[PDB]
Amino acid sequence: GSPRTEYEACRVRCQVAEHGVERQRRCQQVCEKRLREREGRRE
């Protein structure tokens, strides 16, 4: 339904995965796109 874990896990993993602003912001959108795509099975 809405696995917030998959999201919070990406923010805590990505934040440490890289360092900066270009990848940081760009990452926030990537991790989010995956979440929204997950919570949304079909509408």
Swiss-Prot record:
Report the catalytic activity: Endohydrolysis of the N-glycosidic bond at one specific adenosine on the 28S rRNA
Q: Which GO terms describe its biological process?
A: defense response; negative regulation of translation
Identify the keywords attached in UniProt to this record, alphabetized. Disulfide bond, Glycosidase, Hydrolase, Plant defense, Protein synthesis inhibitor, Toxin
Task: Respond yes or no to whether keyword Ubl conjugation is given for this record.
Answer: no
Say which domain of life the source belongs to: Eukaryota
- Give the Gene Ontology MF terms in alphabetical order: rRNA N-glycosylase activity; toxin activity
What does this protein do, in the record's words? Answer: Inhibits protein synthesis in animal cells.
- What is the recorded name of this protein? Ribosome-inactivating protein luffin P1
Q: List the source organism.
A: Luffa aegyptiaca
